[PDB]
Amino acid sequence: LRHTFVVADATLPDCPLVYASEGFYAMTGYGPDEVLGHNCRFLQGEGTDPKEVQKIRDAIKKGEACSVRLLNYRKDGTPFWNLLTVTPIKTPDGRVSKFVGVQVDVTS
Numbered sequence: 001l002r003h004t005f006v007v008a009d010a011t012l013p014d015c016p017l018v019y020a021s022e023g024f025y026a027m028t029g030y031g032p033d034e035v036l037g038h039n040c041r042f043l044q045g046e047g048t049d050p051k052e053v054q055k056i057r058d059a060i061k062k063g064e065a066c067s068v069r070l071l072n073y074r075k076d077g078t079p080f081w082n083l084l085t086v087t088p089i090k091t092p093d094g095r096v097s098k099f100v101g102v103q104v105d106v107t108s
């Protein structure tokens with residue numbers, strides 16, 4: 001299947017993105033100059049379910065893995081359905097260093 005991949009830096013408090021695959025930009029229409037160093041939430045919009053967004057917010061705070069189905073928006077405003085799976089990467093001392101996300105456009 002067609003998927004995308006990003007890396008969030010958990011040492012910084014708001015989990016900014018530090019790496020995105022070629023597909024992530026092409027899927028969403030944002031360039032690296034407007035993605036890197038920002039929280040992934042810029043992809044959200046009016047129809048994003050705040051109950052689902054809360055599920056990721058909690059999991060990141062707890063440091064667990066999570067999977068949600070969010071409504072996102074490209075740079076041109078058009079919506080797409082992003083199945084998102086976040087995964088915590090821990091150092092050997094249990095501390096969370098990075099979060100990693102796989103995004104799949106499941107508008108079908």
Ligand SMILES: *[C@@]12=NC3=[C]C([C])=C([C])[C]=C3N([C][C]([O])[C]([O])[C]([O])[C]OP([O])([O])=O)C1=NC(=O)[N]C2=O
Pocket residue numbers: 006007008015039040041043044053054056057060070072082084086087099100101103
């Ligand atoms: C986003 N992908 C994504 C990828 C990673 C690795 C992480 C950690 C988060 C995301 N998000 C969610 C966003 O960063 C944030 O965690 C949530 O908005 C909830 O937190 P807040 O503080 O806003 O309540 C992704 N969100 C998307 O909408 N699309 C993704 O591709």
